[PDB]
Design an enzyme around this catalytic site. Structure first.
Site, short mmCIF file in Angstrom:
data_model
loop_
_atom_site.label_atom_id
_atom_site.label_comp_id
_atom_site.label_asym_id
_atom_site.label_seq_id
_atom_site.Cartn_x
_atom_site.Cartn_y
_atom_site.Cartn_z
N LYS A 9 11.66 0.64 -3.57
CA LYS A 9 10.67 0.32 -4.59
C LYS A 9 10.57 1.33 -5.72
O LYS A 9 10.03 1.01 -6.77
CB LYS A 9 9.27 0.13 -3.98
CG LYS A 9 9.10 -1.11 -3.11
CD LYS A 9 9.63 -2.36 -3.79
CE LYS A 9 9.19 -3.64 -3.07
NZ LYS A 9 9.56 -3.54 -1.66
N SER B 238 13.00 -3.67 8.15
CA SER B 238 13.78 -4.57 7.28
C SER B 238 15.20 -4.03 7.15
O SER B 238 16.13 -4.78 6.94
CB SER B 238 13.15 -4.71 5.87
OG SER B 238 13.22 -3.47 5.18
C1 LIG Z 1 10.21 -4.47 -1.08
C2 LIG Z 1 10.98 -4.19 0.23
C3 LIG Z 1 12.06 -4.98 0.62
C4 LIG Z 1 12.58 -6.10 -0.28
O1 LIG Z 1 13.15 -5.61 -1.51
P1 LIG Z 1 13.10 -6.57 -2.80
O2 LIG Z 1 13.85 -5.89 -3.90
O3 LIG Z 1 11.55 -6.58 -3.19
O4 LIG Z 1 13.45 -7.95 -2.37
C5 LIG Z 1 12.63 -4.80 1.84
N1 LIG Z 1 12.16 -3.85 2.69
C6 LIG Z 1 11.10 -3.06 2.33
C7 LIG Z 1 10.55 -2.04 3.33
C8 LIG Z 1 10.52 -3.22 1.09
O5 LIG Z 1 9.57 -2.34 0.67
#
Ligand SMILES: *Cc1c(COP(=O)(O)O)cnc(C)c1O
Ligand SMILES: *Cc1c(COP(=O)(O)O)cnc(C)c1O
Lengths: 293, 293
Positions: free
Chosen positions: B41, B255
């Site tokens: 981010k 993620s």
């Molecule tokens: C925001 C985020 C994502 C996704 O990234 P995008 O560019 O917004 O699709 C994945 N994992 C985490 C922990 C995130 O903060």
């Protein structure tokens, strides 16, 4: 190579934009929190292990032993997972879960002693094991490979990054590997450079470092490499830490606030000084302790 | 120009050494946790603000508004502290105290709505405040400057780091800015590249992303930029996350585990594939949730 190992070291050196006197002095901070496992310890952990490998003392698969449970533990567990070693970490059984989770996440084996036996009990058992032959002891406080890491990477980086303009180097002392290694390298330069070490004021508690008994400094320490030693009050370190996040956008730990607090003292007392201070780690692992909120 | 701002982006790309099939495939991971505030981010946060400055919409001292409480909130709070803005983050009053501390550390002001109002009520309040002229809404889900950061930095870095060898790109989708911007750049290349997006399986909960209602993808999303969308089960993402720390020494979030899980599926189904997956953040801020130790 192409592995996580090549992401250790070569950390950024950035200049503070707002805190600090307006007398021509500059304050630059070395962001060791950029190392893969979040702290300056990744350097000494890699060096102690790599140099041992080079001497034939160890090879992947072997057991590594060390009594510790902060960044050194996290760093050693990471280097162990990265390079294929079995890490055994000794510490008293009063470690928070999160605190031991940081080390377990890498698959390290945590061997607990009693709160009573404490850190010193752990140091002893770890030593008992290396002498019995249950694994290679790293011993961060005496292993010359610790400062060797800073003599060969950290110091040269800092010298290269400040284009030799550095006039003062400030470091919070834990094992003293960082200040020892960096000083060793800076002394080899023609231009003089003042080396300033920091220790907590008596009674002050600053995670990562400790006040060493006057005549009980870690073995790797070399008094002639340090020009000055300043005391930093816990509160002063914590305030500067919070100020770094709020006014510079730099989120670091308490000892890092302490290092900048020291760099501020130096900068204020010496117009035109080009000060470099070590920011030991990021502030993330300090959130649960409340020092932020 | 020597500030923390220059440490955003240019994150390392490293090859997994042990997990993955032995069929000629290679799996590389882009380490976004190396960004100053620990997550991918930081790129979009910097871009949305820098670009708004270019358009004369905002200037240091102004108020910035956004409904969020995760990495986006942390990244925005950090850029605001770095660049001199007053950040206001809206969220329902059920954030842990550590979650709030990650944003407040940078001096951001948190404006709470009730649990009843939830994230959607916060989105609404934020929009209202901006319409009342109380500050500039960033709107991470619809702001073109979010994917733009990835079209100009993330994608170009990956292409350069893999020397054009990349054949597949894997990304866990939240705002979809990363997959969107990286795909846009990769499509401009002569060599074809399969774009794979990942979303949580229904019922699965993966911090940072969410399963978007079929016809309610975020505004910045462009379906034609993504070749395949795979579902990742929460458990599978958590397991891969833990296995990365243990077997690779790579400590990251859920993620990120889901992303590597997706890349493993791709690698297994296509011998010789050169897969790149985005590792979104480090594991540090996940320790307290128990997903690890
Ligand atoms: C925001 C985020 C994502 C996704 O990234 P995008 O560019 O917004 O699709 C994945 N994992 C985490 C922990 C995130 O903060
Ligand atoms: C190790 C450490 C230090 C001190 O570094 P040394 O090279 O061991 O002198 C300072 N702060 C923290 C948090 C550390 O982990």
């Amino acid at each position: 190579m192409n592995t996580l190992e090549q992401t250790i070291g070569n950390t950024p050196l950035v200049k503070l934009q707002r805190i600090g006197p307006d007398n021509g002095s500059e304050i630059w901070v070395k962001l060791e929190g950029n190392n893969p496992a979040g702290s300056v310890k990744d350097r000494a952990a890699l060096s102690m292990i790599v140099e041992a490998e080079k001497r034939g003392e160890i090879k992947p698969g072997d057991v590594l032993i060390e009594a510790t449970s902060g960044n050194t533990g996290i760093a050693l567990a990471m280097i162990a997972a990265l390079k294929g070693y079995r890490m055994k970490l000794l510490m008293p059984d009063n470690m928070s879960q999160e605190r031991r989770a940081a080390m377990r996440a890498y698959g390290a084996e945590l061997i607990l002693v009693t709160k009573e036996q404490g850190m010193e009990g752990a140091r002893d058992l770890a030593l008992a094991m290396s002498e019995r032959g249950e694994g290679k002891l790293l011993d961060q406080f005496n292993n010359p490979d610790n400062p060797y890491a800073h003599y060969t990477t950290t110091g040269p980086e800092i010298w290269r990054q400040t284009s030799g303009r550095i006039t003062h180097f400030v470091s919070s002392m834990g094992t003293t590997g960082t200040i020892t290694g960096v000083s060793r390298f800076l002394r080899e330069q023609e231009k003089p450079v003042t080396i300033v070490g920091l220790q907590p004021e008596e009674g002050s508690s600053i995670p990562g470092i400790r006040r060493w008994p006057a005549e009980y400094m870690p073995g790797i320490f070399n008094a002639s490499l340090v020009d000055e030693v300043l005391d930093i009050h816990q509160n002063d370190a914590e305030n500067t830490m919070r100020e770094l996040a709020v006014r510079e956008g730099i989120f670091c730990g308490v000892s890092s606030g302490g290092a900048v607090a020291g760099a501020l003292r130096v900068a204020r007392a010496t117009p035109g000084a080009i000060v470099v201070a070590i920011i030991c780690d990021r502030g993330d692992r300090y959130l649960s302790t409340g020092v932020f909120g």
